[PDB]
Write an enzyme that holds these catalytic residues in place. Structure first.
Site, PDB file in Angstrom:
ATOM      1  N   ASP A  43       0.950  -0.995   0.160  1.00  0.00           N
ATOM      2  CA  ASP A  43      -0.099   0.010  -0.103  1.00  0.00           C
ATOM      3  C   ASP A  43       0.889   1.059   0.077  1.00  0.00           C
ATOM      4  O   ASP A  43       2.022   1.308  -0.089  1.00  0.00           O
ATOM      5  CB  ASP A  43      -1.028  -0.214   1.331  1.00  0.00           C
ATOM      6  CG  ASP A  43      -0.278   0.136   2.568  1.00  0.00           C
ATOM      7  OD1 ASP A  43       0.783   0.612   2.454  1.00  0.00           O
ATOM      8  OD2 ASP A  43      -1.002  -0.217   3.572  1.00  0.00           O
ATOM      9  N   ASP A  45       1.163   4.611   2.459  1.00  0.00           N
ATOM     10  CA  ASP A  45       0.995   5.253   3.615  1.00  0.00           C
ATOM     11  C   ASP A  45       1.102   6.567   3.449  1.00  0.00           C
ATOM     12  O   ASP A  45       2.199   7.143   3.242  1.00  0.00           O
ATOM     13  CB  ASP A  45       1.610   4.560   4.814  1.00  0.00           C
ATOM     14  CG  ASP A  45       1.559   3.032   4.967  1.00  0.00           C
ATOM     15  OD1 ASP A  45       0.472   2.484   5.460  1.00  0.00           O
ATOM     16  OD2 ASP A  45       2.331   2.262   4.413  1.00  0.00           O
ATOM     17  N   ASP A  85      -3.420   4.322   2.921  1.00  0.00           N
ATOM     18  CA  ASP A  85      -3.657   4.132   4.225  1.00  0.00           C
ATOM     19  C   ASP A  85      -3.340   5.327   5.042  1.00  0.00           C
ATOM     20  O   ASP A  85      -2.178   5.690   4.782  1.00  0.00           O
ATOM     21  CB  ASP A  85      -2.934   2.960   4.764  1.00  0.00           C
ATOM     22  CG  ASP A  85      -2.845   2.740   6.137  1.00  0.00           C
ATOM     23  OD1 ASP A  85      -3.726   3.468   6.748  1.00  0.00           O
ATOM     24  OD2 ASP A  85      -2.267   1.606   6.565  1.00  0.00           O
ATOM     25  N   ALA A  99      -0.027  12.331  16.539  1.00  0.00           N
ATOM     26  CA  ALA A  99      -0.195  12.287  17.844  1.00  0.00           C
ATOM     27  C   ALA A  99       0.734  11.047  18.487  1.00  0.00           C
ATOM     28  O   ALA A  99       0.830  10.053  17.880  1.00  0.00           O
ATOM     29  CB  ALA A  99      -1.646  12.200  18.020  1.00  0.00           C
TER      30      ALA A  99
END
Ligand SMILES: CN[C@@H]1[C@@H](O)[C@@H](O[C@@H]2[C@@H](O)[C@H](O[C@H]3O[C@H]([C@@H](C)NC)CC[C@H]3N)[C@@H](N)C[C@H]2N)OC[C@]1(C)O
Ligand SMILES: Nc1ncnc2c1ncn2[C@@H]1O[C@H](COP(=O)(O)CP(=O)(O)OP(=O)(O)O)[C@@H](O)[C@H]1O
Ligand SMILES: [Mn+2]
Ligand SMILES: [Mn+2]
Length: 175
Positions: A43, A45, A85, A99
């Site tokens: 994928d 990201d 993603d 975060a």
């Protein structure tokens, strides 16, 4: 893989036009910081400004894709047969940050390269930090080989000593 590489260019060109920063993460971020493709990637990201999520969704839709699934940390999208993603980063004094990640996770400088073009990617420390979470979900000896090799490659790039003290910081945080 020409389709993924072309798709990454298309996404970043569209984002560039609207002054939307996006950071490549994960496997492609490692390859971007190395300036070398090291394996097939399952994928793409991406880290995006959380308060500009709609702009990223609109680029996905412009490119003929759609949002597929919400996850606890972000969302998956699909453009043709390719998976994106996507996780938010949020403004923190003078930069975007993922975060709970080490400061500097989303540098404004383009510090990687993909097909000769500079690209913004997550810092090595942020790349490696996500493997620490993974390690708490699955022992590293039980990771698929590709993930072991990618981890070891990121760790050699940053430096093994820097990784071990970052790991100690992770353990302190989450003790
Ligand atoms: C779609 N597959 C994804 C996989 O690629 C992988 O996704 C990672 C995901 O694991 C990772 O999440 C980590 O960081 C989260 C949070 C601290 N980020 C701010 C908490 C969960 C922790 N595992 C994200 N930062 C980046 C994301 N691309 O793991 C979850 C998953 C659902 O299997
Ligand atoms: N099941 C899982 N739980 C938690 N974290 C995971 C995870 N699987 C992988 N990770 C972490 O999340 C990051 C992105 O994961 P993936 O996209 O699933 C594999 P990748 O390293 O990007 O290789 P890829 O390029 O083949 O996709 C990994 O770099 C790893 O740090
Ligand atoms: Mn990936
Ligand atoms: Mn992924």
């Amino acid at each position: 893989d020409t389709t993924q590489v072309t798709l990454i260019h298309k996404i970043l060109a569209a984002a560039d036009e609207r002054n939307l920063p996006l950071w490549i993460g994960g496997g492609w971020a490692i390859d971007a910081r190395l300036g070398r493709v090291t394996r097939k990637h399952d994928d793409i990201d991406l880290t995006f400004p959380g308060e500009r999520r709609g702009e990223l969704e609109a680029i996905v839709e412009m490119l003929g894709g759609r949002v597929m699934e919400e996850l606890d940390y972000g969302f998956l999208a699909e453009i043709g047969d390719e998976l994106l993603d996507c996780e938010p980063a949020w403004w923190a004094d003078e930069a975007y940050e993922i975060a709970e990640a080490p400061q500097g996770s989303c540098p404004e400088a383009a510090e990687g390269v993909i097909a000769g073009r500079p690209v913004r990617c997550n810092s090595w420390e942020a790349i490696i930090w996500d493997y620490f979470y993974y390690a708490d979900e699955v022992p590293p000896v039980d990771w698929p080989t590709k993930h072991i090799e990618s981890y070891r490659l990121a760790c050699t790039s940053l430096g093994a000593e820097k990784v071990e003290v970052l790991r100690a910081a992770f353990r302190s945080r989450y003790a």
